[PDB]
Each structure stands twice: as structure tokens, then as C-alpha cells.
Amino acid sequence: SNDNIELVDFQNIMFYGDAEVGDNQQPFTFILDTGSANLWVPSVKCTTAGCLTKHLYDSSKSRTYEKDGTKVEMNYVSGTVSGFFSKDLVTVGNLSLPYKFIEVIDTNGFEPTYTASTFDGILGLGWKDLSIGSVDPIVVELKNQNKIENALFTFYLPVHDKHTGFLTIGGIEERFYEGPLTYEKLNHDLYWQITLDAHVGNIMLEKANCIVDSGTSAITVPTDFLNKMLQNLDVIKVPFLPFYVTLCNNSKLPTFEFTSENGKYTLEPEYYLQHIEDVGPGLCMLNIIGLDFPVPTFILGDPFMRKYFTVFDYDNQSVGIALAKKNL
Ligand SMILES: CSC[C@H](NC(=O)Cc1ccc(N)cc1)C(=O)N[C@@H](Cc1ccccc1)[C@H](O)C(=O)N1CSC(C)(C)[C@H]1C(=O)N[C@H]1c2ccccc2C[C@H]1O
Ligand SMILES: C[C@H](CCC(=O)NCCC[N+](C)(C)CCCS(=O)(=O)[O-])[C@H]1CC[C@H]2[C@@H]3[C@H](O)C[C@@H]4C[C@H](O)CC[C@]4(C)[C@H]3C[C@H](O)[C@]12C
Numbered sequence: 337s338n339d340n341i342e343l344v345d346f347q348n349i350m351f352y353g354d355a356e357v358g359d360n361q362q363p364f365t366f367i368l369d370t371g372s373a374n375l376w377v378p379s380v381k382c383t384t385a386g387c388l389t390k391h392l393y394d395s396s397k398s399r400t401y402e403k404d405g406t407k408v409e410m411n412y413v414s415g416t417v418s419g420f421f422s423k424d425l426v427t428v429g430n431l432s433l434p435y436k437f438i439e440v441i442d443t444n445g446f447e448p449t450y451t452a453s454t455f456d457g458i459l460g461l462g463w464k465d466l467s468i469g470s471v472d473p474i475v476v477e478l479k480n481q482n483k484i485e486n487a488l489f490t491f492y493l494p495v496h497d498k499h500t501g502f503l504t505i506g507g508i509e510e511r512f513y514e515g516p517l518t519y520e521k522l523n524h525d526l527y528w529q530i531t532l533d534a535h536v537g538n539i540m541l542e543k544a545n546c547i548v549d550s551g552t553s554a555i556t557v558p559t560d561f562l563n564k565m566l567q568n569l570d571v572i573k574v575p576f577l578p579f580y581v582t583l584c585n586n587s588k589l590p591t592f593e594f595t596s597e598n599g600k601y602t603l604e605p606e607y608y609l610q611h612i613e614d615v616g617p618g619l620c621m622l623n624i625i626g627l628d629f630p631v632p633t634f635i636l637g638d639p640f641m642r643k644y645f646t647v648f649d650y651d652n653q654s655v656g657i658a659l660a661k662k663n664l
Contacts, residue, residue: 337485338509339429339478343368343501345494348610349553350638352455353503356427357437358398364391366459368491368503369551370528370648373462373473374410375426376438379419386443386450393422393439400425400434408438408468410458416445421469428459428474428505431483436471461489461550461648463526475505476650487650491550492660493642499664513645513658518599522653530655532594532601534634539564545633546594548646548655552637555592555608559626565590571622584609584620594636601644601657608639 341353352365357377364377377393378386395401404421419440426435440457443450464472472480479487484506492512494501508517520530527547534544539561557565569588571580582589592603609620623639647656 338507339431339484339505340509341429341503341505343492343494343503345496345501346454348496350453350455351494351501353459355429355459357393358395358424359400360397361427362391362393362398364393364456365454366457367455367551368459368461369549370461370491371547371549371551372410372412372458372460373464373467374438374460374469374471375435375457375474376410376417376419376440377457378443379439379441381419381439381441382443383441384443386447389451390456392456395422395424395439398424402434404436406469410438410468412446414449415447417450418442418445426474431478431505433474433477433481433483435474435477436469458551462528463650465526473650478505479650488652489648490656491641491646491648492664493638495642495662498662508647508656511664512661514661515659516599517645517647517656517658518596519647519649519652519654519656520596520598522655528648528655529633530596532596532634534561535593535595536561536565537590541632545629545631546636547633548636548640548648548657550638550641552635553639554623554625554635554637555603555639556625556627556633556635556637558632558634559628561632562624562626574621578625580622580624581612581615582609582620582622584611584618589622594634599657601640603640603643607643 343351380392380394402423406421409418417440422439490504523531529547532546534541571582589605594601608623645660
């Protein structure tokens with residue numbers, strides 16, 4: 337009764353899922369991004385080097401293609417893609433719907449991310465008012481069409497060298513989590529953002545904005561908060577890049593603790609260290625980056641979601657959080 341889309345890990349940094357566009361079931365690999373609200377695929381009309389190795393969309397081969405042609409640009413923090421709108425049947429797992437998406441013809445503004453990774457496009461799982469072109473979210477539409485029970489989706493992320501994951505559309509499956517599932521109300525109309533007190537040792541921010549974001553492969557921290565965290569931490573910044581290197585067993589590395597009236601969520605160093613044995617033996621990179629929003633904000637990205645099963649509920653305007661089962 338729920339639609340389960342398998343998630344594959346890529347080099348323990350990101351994860352992808354597959355979906356199809358067109359009646360001839362043209363296959364694509366997507367970053368699944370709760371932080372955006374547009375779907376895009378690279379077109380056979382693409383003029384840029386990044387498209388060379390990708391699965392490309394051919395509207396001429398799909399009888400369900402409906403021409404739109406309205407020009408559009410998606411400006412992400414990691415770069416820009418541009419093209420034009422198109423409409424065609426989009427199949428996610430065993431559910432399909434006619435859907436407006438962007439045919440991308442220029443990916444040069446999205447380098448070096450695009451050529452360095454094996455995804456074809458991005459599938460947004462955000463809120464309608466964050467989309468360009470007023471596109472109802474896939475999950476909201478599937479519910480509206482009575483193809484699913486609830487307008488919610490869940491993420492059970494894969495774990496490099498242990499198990500695959502699933503994006504489940506339409507209901508919550510017990511098999512993904514253990515202990516209590518705690519619901520945190522959205523504090524914004526159109527982001528998967530919740531209020532949590534943030535504690536890292538003696539450093540804390542009360543009632544911080546926390547964005548649960550599937551497309552961000554880091555925990556992001558306010559820059560002042562990070563600078564305090566790093567003081568006498570025996571960590572070294574990489575020349576020219578906002579990444580920090582540490583001995584993996586550095587006994588100073590702290591545990592993030594995020595609390596609500598409802599729940600307590602922790603993130604120990606094992607969840608935010610990336611081994612980099614190639615650069616040096618016993619060295620790790622912190623998957624933590626400094627980033628200032630206008631209101632002090634943390635992004636609870638991939639590292640958080642690897643530990644915690646997450647439920648994104650449109651109807652109840654909340655994020656549900658529970659400890660992910662280590663095995664299925
Ligand atoms: C609707 S869309 C426009 C939106 N712009 C904005 O709000 C403009 C904005 C607003 C506030 C700030 N203070 C800065 C920019 C936007 O881009 N939002 C993204 C989420 C976000 C939002 C805000 C900051 C950072 C990230 C999007 O949801 C997302 O996750 N992206 C873009 S493309 C992408 C590859 C799927 C992924 C990405 O860049 N990941 C990289 C990444 C990112 C930060 C730290 C390490 C890493 C490594 C790697 O994982
Ligand atoms: C989102 C933040 C902050 C960016 C910011 O907003 N900085 C300047 C102002 C923005 N504008 C230029 C749009 C405004 C106009 C200038 S003005 O002076 O008027 O403000 C920027 C700063 C450093 C950026 C990361 C690093 O690169 C490394 C890496 C490179 C890959 O490729 C993509 C992934 C990654 C992780 C990057 C993601 C993201 O991208 C970061 C976090």
C-alpha cells in the first residue's frame with residue numbers, strides 16, 4: 337500500500353534514487369532533496385560537457401510529453417542549471433502522474449558538482465511555494481489523486497557497507513525505526529524547519545532554526561558558533577576550503593545535542609566524521625560547515641538523517657524523528 341523507492345549510497349557522502357520520465361520509461365538517477373521543490377532532468381538538447389555521461393531526456397520519444405517551453409533557471413547554493421519547462425508522466429516507484437518539470441540544457445553553472453557525481457537530476461520534496469512555476473509537490477498530488485493513504489514521505493537512509501535505504505511515500509513503516517517517533521511542528525510555512533535548542537558542550541543556541549535537509553551532505557552551523565566550537569579543538573582547516581581535518585580519535589570532538597519539549601536528538605562524532613585514510617592514516621574530515629542564515633540556523637543534513645529515521649508530513653505540518661534501525 338506504500339510506495340518504497342530504494343536508495344543507494346554514493347561514496348558515503350550522498351545517496352540517490354531512481355525515477356522515470358516519459359511513457360517509454362526513460363530511466364534517471366536523482367538526488368532527492370527535501371530543500372527544493374522542482375524536478376529536473378538533463379535534456380538530449382543539453383549543450384554542455386556535464387551532460388556527456390548522463391541519462392538524457394528525449395521528449396520526441398515520449399507520446400505523453402506536453403510541450404511547455406517557458407524558460408527557467410534553478411539557482412542552488414552549489415550552482416545553477418537552466419532550461420525550460422516540460423510536462424510528461426513521472427513514475428516514482430509504482431506510482432505515476434503527469435507532472436511539470438524542467439528540461440535542463442546548460443549545466444555549466446553547476447560544476448564541478450555535476451560532473452563529479454553520478455546523478456542525472458534533482459527531485460525536490462519541498463513545499464509548493466518554494467517551487468518555480470507553482471508546482472504541487474509530487475507527494476501532495478499523489479494524495480490528492482488518492483494514489484496513497486497520507487501526504488507524507490519518510491527517509492530511511494542507506495549506510496555505506498551495511499544496508500540500502502528507502503524513500504517511502506504515503507505512510508510510516510515500523511520496520512525502519514526503533515524507540516519513540518517524536519513529531520516536531522514546522523516553524524515555517526514552506527521549509528522543513530523546526531525549532532530546537534542546540535547544545536555542543538558549553539556552547540548553546542536556544543530555540544534555533546533547524547532545517548532537516550536530505551540534499552545537504554553536512555551539518556551546517558552558524559559561523560560564530562562554529563568558531564567557538566573549534567577553539568582549542570586540535571582540528572586544522574584545509575587550505576582554500578571550508579573543511580576541517582582531525583585525528584579520527586580526537587577526544588575533544590563534541591556531541592551535538594538538539595532538544596525540544598518533545599524529544600532529544602544527539603549526533604556523536606561517529607556520525608559526522610568521514611575517514612580520509614588516503615590523505616593520511618587515522619585522519620578524518622568533519623562533515624560540518626559554517627554557514628550563516630539571517631536567523632541562526634542549523635542544517636540537519638545527511639549525517640543527521642543517517643542516524644535518525646525521518647517523516648515529512650505535509651498534512652500535519654511536522655517532521656517526525658526516530659532512531660533508525662541499524663538493520664532491516
Ligand atoms: C529552493 S533551491 C535554492 C536553495 N537556495 C537558498 O535557499 C539560498 C540561500 C538561503 C540562505 C543561506 N544562508 C544561503 C543561500 C538551495 O540551494 N537549497 C539547498 C539547501 C541549502 C539551503 C541554504 C544553505 C545551504 C544549503 C538544496 O536544498 C540542497 O540541498 N542542495 C543544492 S543542490 C544539491 C546538491 C541538491 C544540495 C547542495 O548544494 N549540497 C551540498 C551542500 C550544501 C551546504 C553545505 C555542504 C554541502 C555539500 C553538498 O551536499
Ligand atoms: C552557501 C554558502 C555561503 C555562500 C554565500 O552566500 N556566499 C557569498 C554571497 C552569495 N552571493 C554571491 C550569491 C551574493 C552576492 C554577493 S554579496 O557580497 O552581495 O553578498 C557556501 C560557502 C561555501 C560553500 C561550499 C564550498 O564552496 C565547498 C563546496 C563547493 C562545491 O562546489 C559545492 C559544495 C560546497 C560544500 C559549497 C556549498 C555552499 O555553496 C557553501 C557552503
